[PDB]
A = this chain, B = another copy of it.
């Protein structure tokens, strides 16, 4: 919010109709002029015969305007009926504008309602035989492009309501270079019908839609983003917006995403949604619930071929589209509907943060270089760590399990938190019951990363060993009543695991990444470098966590993961085991 956004006390006015933009940009004195409230007051007082059309200098910097409307009815109303009509008109319009702002501009509905219904100004035309007036909401300010977007909703509002004042809303005034007759001036020199100010607003300042004076009672918002039924059913199917899956349920394409019909039915929601892009002679018919259910039955009965879902393992789905792994391109729209994506990370993909440089990417490189130093000793461990974290972006079956082994305060939990903040809902934490002992396995479906945590040192007594039968069962592509296993399974260990039975099929499903960097307290820092289990000791950062849960490093780590994947798992994704690190496997070796 700048000074011009704060307010604009200088006004610009024309003197006739049809002035070319060349004259306006040439500040032609015969047509355009600049005034203030007081200057225009004496101008209109001294020269009533002139015609004055107030507008903006340009739409680039002064897009903020008071919300205004022009009502023109070819009739006359008595005072009491006029009051009833104006009350109904004001309640309907205030509601409609507030709802549009809430659903598009993301503003508070009640704030808009209060600001608009609290204070507004009405004009009055001297033409007795017609009811013509201009309504200006004093305290509500909005950018011009938002009004240009809202003209539609006002058009359907006018076409829908029965109130004559609301039915006679003139939406044509909402367009670039909009000029409105200033109250007190004639429409044309040959017409003697002018507009009259109304109480309690006795000041001319209350009758200009460009005069911006934002006070405590004001609110601001702007648009964030700059037989016949059978024919309707065929038209809907032509858009390829609804599909049948193998599970017997139908997936629909609403809000640029594929959803399930298992909830309250969505086919009807689609049918209402696409009534705008369809010819109006059918759009009239489409809005009765019985006919809409009839069209829905036709659509169900025309869908015979069942299409498999989630066929691409090399695509990362977001809630605003899908990202290609081989490329860095992001698709948002009909390019993403081609890939039948059912789940998503749950957050909008931001191209402004997915750049490469990032104000936080350097500190991310510091954090990753602290948790895993890029040294000649941390060379194979580091690349194994990179590949294991990269495998979480691919939606295919993973054939190996990696054990995250490290001592206390080695950054493993921060690593899980980075991974979850980077891939959204695609990372899930699972308990130890799937190892030592079934919702713990049924909601694992279509997940791309599953983590188990704090194994309670099974080497000592009072523990139920790993029983690698689970490891063999967690490697098969379909998990048992059946679910698709697309999840890289990672295990947190502070102590090396122990297994009851060791087989030749177990060395091919076990991987280990070692963590040996300690983030210690200043007081206990000394007692940190007398231990052989650490290679580097760094000061503990208490402010790191608070940054972590706030999704501060959400997109930089995603960029790192995709860049690693572009290096390692292209064109083939495979995880290789490293049996030579667990001592327990040395025995048979």
Give the B-binding residues of A (Cβ under 8 A). Answer: 88, 91-92, 95-96, 98-99, 102-103, 108-111, 113-114, 160-163, 227, 230-231, 234-235, 237-240, 248, 254-255, 261, 263-264, 266, 268-269, 271-273, 277, 279, 281, 284, 287-289, 292, 294, 297-298, 300-302, 304-305, 334-335, 337-338, 408-409, 429, 431, 439-440, 443, 453-454, 456, 469, 472, 476, 480-481, 500-501, 503-505, 546, 572
Contact = CB atoms under 8 A, between A and B. Distances in A.
Given A109-B240, A469-B454, A160 B234 contact: yes
30 contacts: A88-B279, A92-B235, A95-B238, A96-B238, A99-B239, A108-B338, A109-B240, A109-B337, A110-B335, A162-B281, A163-B279, A227-B288, A230-B288, A248-B263, A248-B264, A264-B300, A271-B301, A272-B302, A273-B304, A289-B298, A289-B301, A292-B301, A431-B480, A440-B480, A453-B472, A454-B503, A456-B469, A456-B500, A456-B501, A546-B572
Nearest to A259: B304
Contacts of A111: 338
Contacts of A476: 429
A255 B305 contact: yes
A102 B240 contact: yes
A408 B505 CA distance: 10
Contacts of A572: 546
A265 to B, nearest CB: 9
Contacts of A108: 338
A95 B239 contact: yes
Contacts of A263: 248
Given A110-B338, A238-B95, A503-B454, A231 B160 contact: yes
A289 B294 contact: yes
Contacts of A99: 237-240
B454 A269 contact: no
A287 B263 CA distance: 28
Nearest to A271: B301
B110 A469 contact: no
A462 to B, nearest CB: 9
Contact of A255 (B92, B161, B304): B304
Contact of A269 (B269, B304, B409, B453): B304
Contacts of A454: 469, 472, 501, 503, 505
Given A110-B337, A240-B99, A454-B469, A231 B161 contact: yes
The listed residue with most B CB atoms (<10 A of its CB), out of A231, A287, A439, A500, is A287
Nearest to A100: B238
Q: Which 7 A-B pairs have the closest CB atoms?
A: A289-B297, A109-B240, A99-B238, A268-B301, A160-B231, A230-B287, A95-B238
